[PDB]
Specification:
part of a larger assembly, 298 residues, Major head protein (chain C), virus, 3 chains
């Protein structure tokens, strides 16, 4: 929900009757879950032996898989998939049911969640992933655009980065909307930008060193002209095509089926196991977090 | 009457109703907070310079 | 039904905040003083003979905004003009309402002045104004951060082996010794800059906001909120207004 933008210059006479106002309803969002899975298979013979630097081949392989699933999770929540699903306009399902895809079976397609990019003010799609070549829309009440395509006109075409000034433009958009974002998650390959704020054509807070035995060349904290103090964080599993401006409290992990133990059939010297868990992603407001894409310069 | 139980063939789907609503419209009002209030008794007020 | 309890109290709260949002925007919009009366304070004859008789067919009223109460120097209709400089103070030689010349930042971009801003502080100092605040829209706050160290050349803002980044300016000291304080306003227009002081502006309240239930005459359940207030300015030349114009 959001207040009305009918501020204008409302002026009323003294002796009139109360005229009907302009009321607008809320807006409902909806995201689907995704199924993660990691299978394990080890012959009984190998599981019976005693490896020279570990225990059984089953638990060791299970632990390796139990960690890979978490890595796959962090990479998907931070991806830009477009919530691939078959249903459409069936969330307020109260007047009837959806028998369009009811006479089907496991042949159904694979469901996908709405990643960071899809849940924000995305301007378009690319089949299954958010399109970065399009500038996102603006909020109805405010005029903020939390999805901005970096110009990079300051830097040349040799180095790409995203920009040095476009980082401050997002803080303006967030403040314009009222978001409380205080974290800037970035890929490690782009940290040289936030630390390498130089190359501004001889200006704009360049550099100096007082001939000291300490060379840092790092930037972790940031403050915008408005006063919003931001803290930069690095994530190895983040993509190298966008930057995220968000807040921890404005995100939540929706877990439907938690990872549990699943012993399957054998069929003869197989000893098959499996890991599986269904998880989704939520966002309190698409305009409560920023996404700064990356593009070339002039 | 589904034979293979799945999510898309269920006549139920009891929706999950979140217990909150998100709002970002700010009401800072820095000017009105620093001006000061003075009560009057006429639709028109005058001052001299 | 389920899930959707009520929409009456929820909407009242929404409207209770919207009415305040409008106030902060109207006082800083720049509208013109609208009224059906005129020169009815020195005739010492009566309130108004020609306006009487009309019960509710009168037209709405408008309060003199920040621009009207200042030395605007002309109107462009229902709102003050943002192009004509204000009239020069007769006593002094001050002009508190100016227009950005836009010397640098060629016409490719609108480019609010970013320079010659100390002239307004001069016009204020010339008018005895005690302005200490510079209310601006956040869309132009970067121009003040760049005033720190850009100078289209070598001024060399320094790191000194530090990781903290600030690049923010909120206080300025005029060459004449006038220390100002920059403040951001989300409801200010993107084509104006207000130099003023808080004590030089008062909020004239006549009818504080209050809720009042009206007649039903059915299942309407009608409610309303109403407040009558005004704006005051001690002296027009006690505050300044700087518009933005590229060319």
């Amino acid at each position: 929900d959001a207040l009305a933008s009918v501020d204008g210059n409302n002026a009323h006479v003294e002796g009139s009757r109360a005229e009907d106002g302009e009321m607008k309803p809320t807006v409902i969002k909806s995201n689907v879950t995704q199924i993660l899975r990691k299978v394990v298979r080890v012959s009984d013979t190998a599981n019976t032996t005693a490896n020279y630097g570990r225990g059984r081949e089953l638990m060791y392989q299970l632990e390796k898989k139990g960690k890979e699933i978490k890595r796959d999770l962090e990479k998907i929540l931070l991806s830009g998939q477009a919530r691939t699903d078959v249903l459409a306009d069936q969330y307020l399902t109260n007047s009837a049911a959806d028998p369009a895809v009811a006479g089907l079976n496991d042949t159904h397609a694979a469901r996908k969640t709405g990643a960071f990019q899809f849940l924000c003010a995305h301007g378009g799609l690319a089949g299954g992933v958010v399109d970065k070549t399009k500038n996102g829309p603006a909020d109805p009440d405010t005029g903020a655009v939390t999805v901005k395509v970096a110009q990079n006109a300051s830097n040349p075409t040799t180095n790409i980065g995203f920009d040095e000034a476009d980082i401050f433009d997002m803080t303006l958009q967030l403040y314009t909307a009222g978001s409380e974002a205080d974290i800037i998650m970035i890929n490690p390959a782009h940290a040289k930008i936030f630390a390498g704020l130089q190359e501004n054509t001889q200006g704009s807070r360049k550099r100096i060193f007082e001939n000291t035995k300490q060379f840092i060349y790092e930037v972790n904290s940031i403050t915008d002209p408005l006063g919003q103090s931001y803290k930069i964080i690095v994530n190895r599993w983040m993509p190298t095509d966008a930057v995220y401006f968000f807040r921890s409290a404005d995100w939540t992990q929706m877990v439907l089926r938690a990872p549990k133990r699943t012993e399957l059939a054998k069929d003869g010297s197989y000893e098959k196991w499996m890991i599986e868990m269904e998880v989704g992603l939520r966002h309190r407001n698409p305009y409560a977090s920023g996404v700064l894409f990356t593009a070339a310069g002039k | 009457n589904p034979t293979l139980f799945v999510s898309y063939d269920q006549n139920g789907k009891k929706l999950s109703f979140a217990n909150w609503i998100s709002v970002l419209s700010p009401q800072d009002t820095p000017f009105v907070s620093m001006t000061g209030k003075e009560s009057i008794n006429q639709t028109i007020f005058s001052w001299q310079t």
